[PDB]
Structures are given as structure tokens and as C-alpha cells.
């Protein structure tokens, strides 16, 4: 099997069905003790929790689902009737993510879209009945953060106050995205210093709030 199958199996055997907190704890234990994996992790996850709680977004778009750790993290804090859309182009990972959300009991709040964000974002309004997004979590391949931010803008999916929250702006780093949003009057930016998941390596999240065109 794969590392991602092993993470899912560990959750199934070390967490409680319908208990998202125990799912997060099981993933973080497995990835600390056994196999590193690119989940946002508990240190940066706590910052995300604080952001989600501050904004109480009704519609969140996640770019990059992997095994479902950040989808579980965010969906467990969504208010009743709020929703998360998560885009994941790797079908093996999308299948793991669905099973992770099912185990956590959060599947009614999350819709997985299997495809590439650059192909799916232009379809959100017509095919997925989106007006504008309240919050976007960018955590896919780092060279896509800037192109997809610009694409979300072009597609009319950002409104004044939409929160963009970007993982890994230090490691691996997203230099063009970071320079662009920090230099742009269309975004108000804040940096949240933290640590790379499961490692004593400095990383950080960037929050970029859209200000309109
Ligand atoms: C860092 S992992 C996501 C981790 C997840 N957000 C978490 O914290 O649990 C990055 C993911 O982005 C996916 N990916 C990369 N480029 C993508 C794209 N253009 N569209 C959709 N998914 C993409 C990869 O297949 C991978 O699963
Ligand atoms: C390239 C890679 O795998 C590494 C970290 C990483 C961490 C993330 O949090 C993340 O989202 C992504 N990503 O490529 O999407 C990657 C390292 C340290 O090698
Ligand atoms: Mg990441």
C-alpha cells in the first residue's frame, strides 16, 4: 500500500468514528511518530482554527486536499449549513479524503471536486452554484498560488473581505504569490509565523484579505 493508505488505516484503527478531534490527533500522531506527510499539522492548524473561528465563513474553498486533514480541521468548525468545497486533482488522494471525511462524520459539509483547480475554478459559478467565496485555503502546488488567486479574481469569486489563507509561504515557499499580494492594494496581508508540520523548521501562513478591484 501507500503512505496515504497507511495514514487512513491508522485513523480507522486509532480514532473514534464521528469524532473529528480524534481523527486529527490520530493523523498527527502517525505523522510524528511513523511517516512524515504534508498535512498542515497541528501548529499551523491551530492558527487556521483561530482564523476560521474569527470569520465563521459560510463557503470555504480549499485548494489541495491530500488525505483530508485540513478539510476535517476546517469542516469541524463550520457552522450548521456552512460548506467546504475542496479541489484535489490526484484521484488516489481524493478517494482517501472522502473516506477520511466519512470517518470523521463531516461528509455532509464537504464536497470533494476531483480535478485540477485551474480547470474547476472557472466552473464554480455555473456548475457548483457558487456566488462568491468567504474564505480560500491555498495549499496545493506552490507555483499555482498566484495563478489561481488571479483566476479566482477573474472569475468574480472574490468579494470585499474574502479571506485567502496560504500555507507554506516560507517552506517550500511561494515567492511570487507573497510578493504579489503584499505589494497589491487589492489585498491586506498579515503573516503568521509557525512551524512546518511535524518538524522543527520555521514556516508560516499568509492571510491576504481581498479589498475589491
Ligand atoms: C499539501 S497537499 C494538501 C494538504 C491538505 N491541505 C492538508 O493540510 O491536509 C497538496 C495537494 O494539492 C494537490 N494539487 C496540486 N496541484 C493541484 C491543482 N492544481 N489542483 C488540485 N489539486 C492540486 C496535490 O495532489 C496534493 O494532494
Ligand atoms: C515538497 C514537500 O513535499 C515538502 C513540504 C511540503 C509541505 C506542505 O505543507 C505542502 O503543502 C507541500 N506541498 O507540496 O504541497 C509540501 C518538503 C519539506 O519536502
Ligand atoms: Mg501545506
**Resolution, angstroms, 1 dp:** 1.6
User: Residue 140: which residues within 8 A CB-CB, separation 6 or more?
Assistant: 63, 64, 87, 117, 148
Sheet holding 83-88, edge to edge: 110-114, 83-88, 59-63, 135-138, 163-166, 202-210, 187-195
3-state secondary structure (DSSP) of residue 134: coil
Q: Which atom of ligand 1 is nearest to the CA of 197?
A: 8
Kindly give the residue spans of alpha helices, DSSP state H, lying in 76-109. Answer: 91-104
Distance from the alpha carbon of residue 196 to the mean position of ligand 2, in angstroms:
9
Sequence-distant (6+) residues with CB within 8 A of 120 are 87, 113
142 is catalytic: yes
What method did the depositors use to determine the structure?
X-ray
| Residue 86: alpha-carbon gap to chain centroid | 7
Looking at the structure of the chain, the number of domains it has is: 1
Q: How far apart are CA 162 and CA 57, in angstroms?
A: 9
Domain that holds residue 22: 1-213
In terms of phi and psi (left: phi > 0; alpha: psi -120 to 50; beta: otherwise), the region of 191 is: beta
Can you read off the three cell numbers belonging to residue 152? 479566482
Per annotation, catalytic residue among 4, 28, 42, 139: 139
Q: How far apart are CA 188 and CA 175, in angstroms?
A: 17
With a CB cutoff of 8 Å and minimum separation 6, the contacts of 134 are 55, 57, 58, 59, 60, 162, 163
Q: Answer for the pair 116, 143: CB distance below 8 angstroms, yes or no.
A: no
d(CA 150, CA 122): 12
Closest by CA to 136, choosing from 199, 203, 187, is 187
Of the residues 28, 167, 203, 206, which is catalytic?
167
Atom number, ligand 2, closest to the C-alpha of residue 199 = 18
Amino acid at each position: 500500500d501507500t503512505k496515504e493508505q497507511r495514514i487512513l488505516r491508522y485513523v480507522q484503527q486509532n480514532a473514534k468514528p464521528g469524532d473529528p478531534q480524534s481523527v486529527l490527533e490520530a493523523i498527527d500522531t502517525y505523522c510524528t511518530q511513523k511517516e512524515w506527510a504534508m498535512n498542515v499539522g497541528d501548529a499551523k492548524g491551530q492558527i487556521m482554527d483561530a482564523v476560521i473561528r474569527e470569520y465563521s465563513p459560510s463557503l470555504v474553498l480549499e485548494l489541495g486536499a491530500y488525505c483530508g486533514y485540513s478539510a476535517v480541521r476546517m469542516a469541524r468548525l463550520l457552522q450548521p449549513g456552512a460548506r467546504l468545497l475542496t479541489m484535489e486533482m490526484n484521484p488516489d488522494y481524493a478517494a482517501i479524503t472522502q473516506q477520511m471525511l466519512n470517518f470523521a462524520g463531516l461528509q455532509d459539509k464537504v464536497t470533494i471536486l476531483n480535478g485540477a483547480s485551474q480547470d474547476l475554478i472557472p466552473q464554480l459559478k455555473k456548475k457548483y452554484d457558487v456566488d462568491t467565496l468567504d474564505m480560500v485555503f491555498l495549499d496545493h502546488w506552490k507555483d499555482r498560488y498566484l495563478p489561481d488567486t488571479l483566476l479566482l479574481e477573474k472569475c468574480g469569486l472574490l468579494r470585499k473581505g474574502t479571506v485567502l489563507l496560504a500555507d507554506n509561504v516560507i517552506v517550500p515557499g511561494t515567492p511570487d504569490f507573497l510578493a504579489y499580494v503584499r505589494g497589491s492594494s487589492s489585498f491586506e496581508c498579515t503573516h503568521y509565523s509557525s512551524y512546518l508540520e511535524y518538524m522543527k523548521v520555521v514556516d508560516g501562513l499568509e492571510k491576504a484579505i481581498y479589498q475589491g478591484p
